[PDB]
């Protein structure tokens, strides 16, 4: 099991985390205020803990088989998500509840995007920043996690070299959060509203400074930037490594990957169906606004990002509800997405197809292939075993949220907002957490843990056969 | 393709069906009234059609491969369900709409149990009978269909001998609808309310004479009979053939089958969780009533029967919603059930299990086995390919119902009531069809067609590769 060597990397992360608490405090000094003291408390609070899991240790046992790696990523999200709830807890200045602080933290970390703190428009910019930061960080926590996770769950798609992997990611990540934040600034976003939004935009997070997210400034120019960098960020960073470990070698590098392709078909089709139905029901008086809102939504909520510019005014009930299911897809694998990713669908619809044909030609031998042949005994089994589970989780979560207190259709929209790391409600406009049954807030946090770990990795902790 | 030889069995069925229209008319002569003339019109109306598909024919081409059988059972339910809407259409005495007549017919035939005609308490007993009959018939239509359907979709669980199969079923069927109807009569049900209820009870139908179904007479004695014959009927007739092709050879014949076992565990556990939560929230003042209602519900709605004695008074929101998901199981295979049957779950949870283990011991070779080993390349693929489809259907149906007009959570409860051939609503008490958006009534009819054909057999009609 090698518990020790684990607690050591926990102290490494705890400690490695504290060093972040400064960036927001740097802001409660620079920007106005003076009330970002709860970060400097947190900085010592956690800096201290870290080197107290790591000092009574110093024991690099490397790898340590399957049963360790699982336990690690669970802790990674488990712990650093709990820590995050400290500056909220402490800084009882934009004073929040405890479950609230936890929620607004885990949701911040997991690039989910679900808020319990309202009236954030006028807050301390050290606290406003901390919220966007955790998303930008968690955002990294995923891409490097979706490269050192393939050794386990993410198959069919080390110790001193996994490092020089992420190393590369940092750049793709950094290039984007700047390439964006600048483009956002030219849009006219205050520098702070350009760097705190370009944080939660690459991370498919969903957090905003403004209370009404991208309701923001009605600028088609901003809504055009976001939608672009969502599409980009929502598309698999190992394909970016391809376009940008060389330079102008980008072209067909993308159009050649089928998941990237499939994803593009889905985005065009989804927008089509959404944009056209905005015009059938005359939801806007200017077929331009139709274009604006339709295209933004089918992209932000499709990719499990979570940004919203509409209340869904005269929008046909259909469109949100359709958009609520969209979130079950969105985000190529190895992206910042979160629904059972693009391929898992792509595959699913192929593996299902094979099944109908296997009804007419029960002789012929088909083998599900993407460019060159999946593994119809093995990876095929993994996909539509994951699906089932995904649904089993969803059903238990909704059923536990319904017991917990809150109503039927809401539990529905809540788990759907959480499990796909989406953020908003989206059903029949009932979309606001925070003042939810408190027990329910926990069910919810434990729901977005499932969505981030793609179920198994954490589902397997309950197994009997994971314990020995 | 052999179209001809098909249209011939259609005329055989149409005609073979007309001969039934007399049984209800026999009642509009015996029982009071005099207004069961629309049955005798129907009797000639259809008797005529039948021998007009079958006379310009007489061409027994036998079997005719896969692509015919599929087309047949589709027509079976498609046509005989349309005919059924005739005595309703005609008998504009308990006068009904057209989509209403079709709905109240398809739902009657498919042992679904969803009604659009209200105030049926005081109606012509020829029409009241016809409703229960269609369920009793359709009830047969399923057991003989789940024995001459294994040659196609129902695998891993002919022409002059498939006959002497059903032959046997008729008896098991007949024994039960009498064994019951008598027990119901001693309960005190009027003879007619004993034979029209013992119709829709074996057929896991759900239809009642009384408007408030088994609200009926508050007798624990009736609620005790129904629950028994539901459990019995809800359990796989080829296991009955075992206990009763010999006699006292019943004993472990059941307890040895794993699906029968699995089903029993689910019934006890479900009732436990339901019965105990009725006492935690003090929903009844006499822990006896708790026992009564809890046990009835977790059986009628679990097995996709659909009978209800409660409105769900002080019942915790949780329990109905939990019961609404229950309907996705219920009914061993080769029963009168309708959820993706007991095994499909049983298997599903096993095939899922195998998947977690395949995360820890990626070397070891597991093979999902029930008594002696399913086919981890083949039947396993079929199960959780069916599941996915089941969910795909559900989602499209709910999304089409939501477009069609009706609201979000209702569409949810409607498709869930239709696809599992359940009958009632069950969500947050909003449970009444009939006066629903009319287009939606069709989406609903075409939803319970899917539930009865277990998806594929009709899903495959849309295929490209089914057409040549
Ligand atoms: K999000
Ligand atoms: K039923």
Curated annotation (Swiss-Prot), chains A, B:
- Region called Selectivity filter part 2, residue ranges: 203-208
So where does K(+) get bound?
111-112, 204-205, 304-305, 421-422
Alphabetically ordered keywords of this record? Cell inner membrane, Cell membrane, Ion channel, Ion transport, Membrane, Metal-binding, Potassium, Potassium transport, Transmembrane, Transmembrane helix, Transport
> What are the boundaries of the region Selectivity filter part 1?
110-115
One GO CC term on file: plasma membrane
Report if keyword Hydrolase is assigned: no
* InterPro entries from the UniProt entry: Cat_transpt, TrkH
Which ranges does the record list as Cytoplasmic topological domains?
A: 1-2, 58-65
For the keyword Transport, the answer is yes
Instruction: Kindly give the membrane topology term recorded for this protein.
Output: Multi-pass membrane protein
Q: Which GO terms describe its biological process?
A: potassium ion transmembrane transport
Bilayer-spanning residue ranges:
3-29, 36-57, 66-90, 125-150, 162-186, 260-280, 376-403
- What Pfam families does the database record attribute to this sequence? TrkH
MF terms from GO for this chain are: identical protein binding; potassium channel activity; potassium ion binding; potassium:chloride symporter activity; protein homodimerization activity
Outcome of altering residue 452 to A?
Significant increase in the rate of potassium ion flux
Cellular compartment(s): Cell inner membrane
Q: Where is this region: Selectivity filter part 3?
A: 303-308
**Region (Selectivity filter part 4) spans which residues?**
420-425
- Positions in the Periplasmic compartment: 30-35, 116-124, 187-189, 209-218, 309-316, 404-405, 426-437
What regions sit within the bilayer but not across it?
Answer: 98-109, 110-115, 190, 191-202, 203-208, 219-234, 287-302, 303-308, 317-328, 329-341, 406-407, 408-418, 419-425, 438-449
What's the domain of life for this entry?
Bacteria
PANTHER family listed in its UniProt record: TRK SYSTEM POTASSIUM UPTAKE PROTEIN TRKG-RELATED
Protein family: Belongs to the TrkH potassium transport family.
- Report what the protein is called: Trk system potassium uptake protein TrkH
């Amino acid at each position: 099991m090698q518990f020790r060597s684990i607690i050591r990397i926990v102290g490494l992360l705890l400690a490695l985390f504290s060093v972040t608490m400064l960036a927001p405090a740097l802001v409660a000094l620079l920007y106005r205020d003076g009330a970002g003291v709860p970060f400097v408390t947190t900085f010592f609070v956690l800096l201290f803990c870290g080197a107290m899991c790591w000092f009574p240790n110093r024991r690099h046992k490397h790898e340590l088989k399957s049963r360790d790696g699982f336990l690690i990523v669970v802790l990674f999200w488990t712990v650093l998500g709990s820590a995050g709830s400290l500056p909220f807890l402490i800084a009882d200045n934009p004073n929040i509840s405890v479950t609230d602080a936890f929620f607004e933290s885990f949701s911040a970390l997991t690039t989910t995007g679900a808020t319990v703190i309202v009236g954030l428009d006028e807050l301390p910019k050290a606290i406003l920043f901390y919220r966007q930061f955790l998303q930008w960080f968690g955002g990294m926590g995923i891409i490097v996690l979706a490269v050192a996770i393939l050794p386990v769950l993410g198959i069919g798609g080390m110790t001193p070299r996994i490092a020089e992997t992420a190393k590369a990611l940092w750049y793709i990540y950094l290039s984007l959060t700047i390439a964006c934040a600048v483009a956002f600034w030219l849009a006219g976003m205050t520098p702070f509203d350009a760097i705190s939004h370009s944080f939660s935009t690459i991370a498919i997070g969903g957090f905003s400074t403004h209370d009404a997210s991208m309701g923001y400034f009605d600028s088609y120019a901003i809504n055009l930037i976001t939608v672009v960098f969502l599409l980009i960020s929502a598309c698999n960073f190992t394909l970016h490594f391809a376009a940008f470990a060389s330079g102008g070698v980008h072209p067909k590098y993308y159009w050649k990957d089928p998941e990237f392709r499939a994803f593009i078909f889905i985005q065009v089709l989804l927008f089509l169906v959404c944009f056209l139905l905005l015009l059938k029901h005359h939801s806007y008086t200017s077929p331009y606004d139709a274009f604006d809102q339709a295209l933004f939504q089918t992209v932000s909520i499709s990719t499990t990002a979570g940004f919203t510019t509409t209340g869904f005014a005269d929008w046909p009930l259909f469109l949100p509800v359709l958009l609520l299911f969209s979130s079950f897809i969105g985000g190529c694998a190895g992206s910042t997405g979160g629904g059972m990713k693009v391929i898992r669908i792509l595959l699913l619809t192929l593996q299902g197809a094979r099944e109908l044909k296997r009804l007419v030609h029960p002789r012929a031998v088909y083998t599900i292939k993407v460019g060159g042949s999946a593994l119809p005994q093995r990876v095929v089994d993994a996909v539509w075993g994951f699906f089932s589970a995904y649904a089993l989780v969803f059903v238990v979560c909704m059923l536990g949220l319904i017991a917990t207190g809150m109503d039927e259709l809401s539990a529905f929209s809540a788990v759907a907002a959480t499990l796909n790391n989406l953020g908003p409600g989206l059903g029949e406009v009932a979309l606001h957490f925070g003042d939810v049954n408190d027990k329910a807030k926990w069910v919810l946090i434990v729901s977005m843990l499932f969505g981030r770990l793609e179920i198994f990795t954490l589902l397997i902790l309950l197994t009997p056969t994971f314990w020995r």
